[PDB]
């Protein structure tokens, strides 16, 4: 088949579902912070696969871990034991400090597991009457595309037309303690699920003290605090978990994306015994969850973040990026925000230009990024980037923004 | 890290969730139809990872496909195009004869997507009033562990304790045309989802003509026929799809498990334009869905089934297996059933023995299998198995069954 970008677009339009509207670029190779298309052109990756490639594309140490296990064993299922799962479980639990881990594959799967864990704990420990348990969510949230995940969404694009919704899901505003407090008055609430920073909403960072307040309010009302760190976790914001900035310990933590460096779908639910053990043998599972292959790549992927001090780099580099982005004109950039290497700028949609246009020109100029709402562009380059490369990227951003 | 089977069991009991009760065997290597534990012992694999390794463990052609792509590109996300997704889409659609494919990762994800596709089609094409769409399922069904999947389950173990359930899900008996006809009288039904052969239920094969009747009933009442071939498809039963035995063409087909030969979580939803295009850009997705790496292994995994005539081998060998299991005494074994290489025997649970005990001794004798209900043992060996090896396996089964 088709070796031209236009041929690649055409073949997908014909044989694939139209559930996505991609930026017209056809990539075939990626290494570190770089991506090359079919026409041989080189691009700075400022999307990182939505934070799934924190360690850069095809990181050698992660790649070798995959190559080393494929020849040995890749899948036995959890009906038998393999030698790799135990190692990964011991490593991840001690690294984050929780008794146990429940392994799954994709991000939503981790979110569903946490909801099942919260409901089961709600009924068996808190003593909520059977099928009256509620889980509170914050407006702007994103945790996946299952029927359950779109039922807590405030985005019409996600739920409109998707049959009847999952009951028991409440929604309150984000970054609002009084709202939370009011909602937790209902003794039927089992958990509150939140993102320490809302990514898909447009990198909305809550006020300092928000996570501390949530922790206090949840502890006080005997409600589980579930932190979704699938996008904000793993060094992306400057810490192992974004929650670390306020020294807060959630009851359940969700990890996904970058947990495999982009080489395999691996996700995890971390929590202590009193919550985790409410699920008995045969009550929950997944065919590929906890397979030998994904466990090997996750160990290596976690090691790369540690050995290379990627959080520290993200933290230091994040400051420079943001500082430089605040110099741009206000008639184009109304806001700059973020933490570590998860940032965003807000474009002033006028009748001549918008975020999609800015992204296309940014592409023409060598940098890949995608808008999140038509006026919000997110910048999230692999954490392995160096200051010189970042400096180079910023020049492209300045050049592009100012050329309008 | 613990090198003993008992050390491996203990480590997992300590750091991992107790959602599974595995057969006490610790595997570390697998090749074709064989599995070796940590003590170096060899076993015939008669579970195949629940039909995920039809092509045998670590098939060289699939493994090389993975090794070849890891060095190039593994994940860009669907915010940009890659060069591999279009190829896989063109290949899979033409192979099964549907206009398009929507790529996902796990089996449940494919099932959720189909439910979303059915609800959207129900409202936009069939004209059902917003949020009145229903999907009918069959008792005994299994399509995953998300909150939505356990909502159509008739298995208490799957749903008990899991908060309130997803509305709009009706359940009728399996292998019952009159029940289906009665259910489809309701103009608010959008789809009927069924397994051609119910695997987890204990390999329950419906009567000849059942799939033809479902097709006629669905077509007549303008209801989508969704066939879940995640376990029965891909040569396992003797045909590309189990539905092929009756020459039936479902509206939506779900593939998973063996679509990657056990090397990566890849699943697919196949259907024509009139159903697929009800989902617009931005209305559905997955981070890892349709990634370059999984697409490469799926193409190779599909090619292996073709080039090696595994369907024909599964068909021919299934007859021998079943014939031999039928020579079994009638006081120990009650039933023998199946199609191709998806089979099961029903054990008479007496106060002295059961299916779990039979599997433990089967393990002691060199063969791995797991019971599905305490009196049902499923036999599903990789499709690459040869007659001599099957003959050898049968001797172990005879030896074991008769030693009680
Ligand atoms: C990516 C994401 C998810 C959804 O995960 P998938 O692997 O796409 O299912 C969940 N939560 C957050 C906050 C995410 O960014
Ligand atoms: C395995 C299976 C699934 C569930 O798939 P996962 O990959 O485990 O999510 C769905 N349907 C059927 C019939 C299956 O056998």
Both tokens of residue B355?
A: 């299916």
CB A188 within 8 A of CB A133: yes
Give the Cα separation of B254 and A32 in Å (integer). Answer: 35
Kind plus residue range of the DSSP H or E element containing A227: strand A224-228
**Whole-angstrom distance between the N-terminal and C-terminal Cα of chain A?**
38
Both tokens of residue B281?
A: 């850009």
- H helices present in A258-348, as ranges: 273-276, 292-307, 310-325
Give the Cα separation of B101 and B272 in Å (integer). Answer: 9
**Number of continuous H segments (helices) and E segments (strands) in chain A:** 13, 15
A59-308 is classed in which CATH architecture? 3-Layer(aba) Sandwich (3.40)
Q: In 3-state terms, what secondary structure has residue A75?
A: coil
CB A366 within 8 A of CB A37: no
What is residue B126's DSSP assignment? I
Give the Cα separation of A71 and A241 in Å (integer). Answer: 34
> To the nearest whole angstrom, how far is the Cα of B319 from the nearest Cα of chain A?
26
Judged by its nearest atom, the ligand closest to the C-alpha of residue A105 is 1
Chain B residues closer than 8 Å to A264 by CB: 264-265, 293
- Asked whether the beta carbons of residue A86 and residue B15 sit closer than 8 angstroms, the reply is yes
Ligand 2 binding pocket mutation candidate from A287, A289, A291 (most atoms within 8 A of CB)? A287
Question: How many residues in chain B?
Answer: 404
Of B49, B87, B147, the CB nearest to A76: B49
A148 contact B CB<8A: yes
- Active-site annotation holds for A132: no
CB A178 within 8 A of CB A210: no
Q: In 3-state terms, what secondary structure has residue A2?
A: coil
- Asked whether the beta carbons of residue B168 and residue A168 sit closer than 8 angstroms, the reply is no
B199 contact A CB<8A: no
Distance (Å) from CA A215 to ligand 2 centroid: 37
Across-strand partners of A194? Answer: A227
CB A247 within 8 A of CB A135: no
What are the extents of the domains in chain A?
1-58+309-404, 59-308
Count CB atoms within 10 A of the CB of residue A319.
Answer: 11
CB B177 within 8 A of CB B210: yes
- Discontinuities in chain B with C to N beyond 2.5 Å fall right after none
Give the Cα separation of A58 and A13 in Å (integer). Answer: 28
Task: Name the one residue in this structure whose structure tokens are 């029903």.
Answer: B346
Residue of A287, A373, A376 to mutate when probing chain B, most B C-beta within 10 A: A287
Q: What angle do CA A28, A305, A307 make, to 5 degrees?
A: 120
Both tokens of residue B165?
A: 């359930």
- Asked whether the beta carbons of residue B264 and residue A264 sit closer than 8 angstroms, the reply is yes
CB A74 within 8 A of CB A237: no
Ligand 1 binding pocket mutation candidate from A51, A146, A231 (most atoms within 8 A of CB)? A231
Both tokens of residue B67?
A: 């090794």
A28 contact B CB<8A: yes
Q: In 3-state terms, what secondary structure has residue A235?
A: coil
B22 contact A CB<8A: yes
Chain A residues closer than 8 Å to B81 by CB: 5, 8-9, 12, 22, 24-27
Which atom of ligand 2 sits closest to the CA of residue B141? 13
Give the Cα separation of B294 and B284 in Å (integer). Answer: 19
Instruction: Output the CA torsion B17→B22→B28→B31 (10° steps).
Output: -130
Chain A residues closer than 8 Å to B123 by CB: 161
Rounded to a whole number, what is the largest CA-CA distance in chain A? 62
CB B79 within 8 A of CB B291: no
Ligand 1 binding pocket mutation candidate from A52, A107, A259, A260 (most atoms within 8 A of CB)? A107
Nearest to B288 by CA among B278, B280, B298, B302: B298
Q: Which residue of A lies nearest to B119 if distances are taken between CA atoms?
A: A163
Give the Cα separation of B225 and B190 in Å (integer). Answer: 9
Residue of A37, A39, A161, A253 to mutate when probing chain B, most B C-beta within 10 A: A161
CB A98 within 8 A of CB A270: yes
> Beta strand pairing status for B376-379 and B80-82?
unpaired
- Active-site annotation holds for B228: yes
Across-strand partners of A350? Answer: A353
Give the Cα separation of B322 and B312 in Å (integer). Answer: 16
Counting Cα atoms < 13 Å in the Cβ hemisphere of A397 gives 28
Give the Cα separation of B404 and B393 in Å (integer). Answer: 18
Chain A residues closer than 8 Å to B23 by CB: 79-80
Across-strand partners of B26? Answer: A81
B326 contact A CB<8A: no
Chain B residues closer than 8 Å to A116 by CB: 145, 147, 162-163
Across-strand partners of A346? Answer: A335, A376
CB B143 within 8 A of CB B229: no
Distance (Å) from CA B258 to ligand 2 centroid: 11
Chain B residues closer than 8 Å to A286 by CB: 106, 108, 144-145
Give the Cα separation of A223 and A187 in Å (integer). Answer: 9
Q: Which B residues, 203 through 222, put their C-beta within 8 Å of a C-beta on chain A?
A: none
Give the Cα separation of B235 and B341 in Å (integer). Answer: 9
Both tokens of residue B108?
A: 């449940």
Give the Cα separation of B48 and B235 in Å (integer). Answer: 13
Resolution given for this structure, in angstroms: 2.5
- H helices present in A1-84, as ranges: 5-15, 48-51, 60-70
Q: Does domain B1-58+309-404 have CATH number 3.90.1150.10?
A: yes
Mention every residue, 6+ apart, whose C-beta is less than 8 A from residue A150.
A144, A158, A159, A162, A165
Instruction: Output helix, strand, coil percentages for chain B, rounded to the nearest 5.
Output: 40, 20, 40
> Beta strand pairing status for B267-271 and B376-379?
unpaired
Determine which one of A120, A134, A257, A339 is catalytic: A257
A81 contact B CB<8A: yes
What is the sign, positive or negative, of the torsion defined by CA atoms of B399, B402, B403, B404? positive
Q: Which B residues, 287 through 306, put their C-beta within 8 Å of a C-beta on chain A?
A: 287-288, 290, 293
- Active-site annotation holds for A257: yes
Q: In 3-state terms, what secondary structure has residue A284?
A: coil
Judged by its nearest atom, the ligand closest to the C-alpha of residue B78 is 1
Of B73, B86, B148, the CB nearest to A11: B86
Counting Cα atoms < 13 Å in the Cβ hemisphere of B241 gives 24
Residue A187 CA, distance from chain mean position: 30
**Number of continuous H segments (helices) and E segments (strands) in chain B:** 13, 15
DSSP letter string over A93-146? Answer: HHHHT-SEEEEESSHHHHHHHHHHHHHHHIIIII---TT--EEEEETT----SS
Across-strand partners of A259? Answer: none
Nearest to B102 by CA among B266, B226, B214, B249: B266
Nearest to A26 by CA among A387, A363, A392: A363
**Whole-angstrom distance between the N-terminal and C-terminal Cα of chain B?**
38
- CB neighbour burial string for A6-40, b if at least 16 within 10 angstroms, e if fewer: eebbebbeebbbbbbebbebbbbbbbbbbbbbbee
Kind plus residue range of the DSSP H or E element containing B391: helix B387-402
Q: In 3-state terms, what secondary structure has residue A167?
A: coil
φ/ψ of residue B145, rounded to 5: -120, 15
CB A75 within 8 A of CB B52: yes
B26 contact A CB<8A: yes
Counting Cα atoms < 13 Å in the Cβ hemisphere of A294 gives 28
- Asked whether the beta carbons of residue A77 and residue B38 sit closer than 8 angstroms, the reply is no
Judged by its nearest atom, the ligand closest to the C-alpha of residue A254 is 1
What technique determined this structure?
Answer: X-ray
Q: In 3-state terms, what secondary structure has residue B268?
A: strand
Nearest to B115 by CA among A166, A140, A283: A166
Chain B residues closer than 8 Å to A256 by CB: 287
- Secondary structure (H, E, C), B180-227: HHHHCCCCCEEEEEECCCECCCCCECCCCCHHHHHHHHHHHHCCEEEE
What distances in angstroms separate CA B314 from CA B100, B338, B342, one per listed residue? Answer: 28, 11, 9
């Amino acid at each position: 088949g088709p070796p031209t970008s236009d041929d690649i677009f055409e073949r997908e339009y014909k044989y694939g579902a139209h559930n996505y509207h991609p930026l017209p670029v056809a990539l075939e190779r990626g290494k570190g912070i770089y991506l090359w298309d079919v026409e041989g052109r080189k691009y700075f990756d400022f999307l990182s696969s939505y934070s799934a490639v924190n360690q850069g594309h095809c990181h050698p140490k992660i790649v070798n871990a995959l190559k080393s296990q494929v020849d040995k064993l890749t899948l036995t299922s959890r009906a038998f034991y393999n030698n790799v799962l135990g190692e990964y479980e011991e490593y991840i639990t001690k690294l984050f400090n929780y008794h146990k881990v429940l392994p799954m594959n994709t991000g939503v799967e981790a979110g569903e597991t946490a909801c099942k864990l919260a409901r089961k704990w709600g009924y068996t420990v808190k003593g909520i009457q059977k099928y009256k348990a509620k889980i509170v969510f914050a407006a702007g949230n994103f945790w996946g595309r299952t029927l359950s995940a779109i039922s807590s969404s405030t985005d019409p694009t996600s739920y409109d037309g998707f049959g009847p919704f999952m009951p028991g899901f409440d929604i309150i505003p984000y970054n609002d303690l009084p709202a939370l407090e009011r909602a937790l008055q209902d003794p039927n609430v089992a958990a509150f699920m939140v993102e320490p920073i809302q990514g898909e909403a447009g990198v909305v960072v809550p006020d300092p003290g928000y996570l501390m307040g949530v922790r206090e309010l949840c502890t006080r009302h005997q409600v589980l605090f579930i932190a979704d760190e699938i996008q904000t976790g793993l060094a992306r914001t400057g810490r192992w978990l974004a929650v670390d900035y306020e020294n807060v310990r959630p009851d359940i933590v969700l990890l996904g994306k970058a947990l495999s460096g982009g080489l395999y779908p691996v996700s995890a639910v971390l929590c202590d015994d009193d919550i985790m053990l409410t699920i008995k043998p045969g009550e929950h599972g997944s065919t590929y969850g906890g397979n030998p292959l994904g466990c090997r790549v996750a160990i290596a992927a976690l090691e790369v973040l540690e050995e290379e001090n990627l959080a520290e780099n993200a933290d230091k580099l994040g400051i420079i990026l943001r500082n430089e982005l605040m110099k741009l004109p206000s008639d184009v950039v109304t806001a700059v925000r973020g933490k570590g290497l998860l940032n965003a700028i807000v474009i002033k949609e006028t009748k001549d230009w918008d975020a999609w246009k800015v992204c296309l020109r940014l592409r023409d100029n060598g940098l890949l990024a995608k808008p999140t709402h038509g006026d919000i562009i997110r910048f999230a380059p692999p954490l392995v980037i160096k200051e010189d490369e970042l400096r180079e990227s910023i020049e492209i951003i300045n050049k592009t923004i100012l050329s309008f």
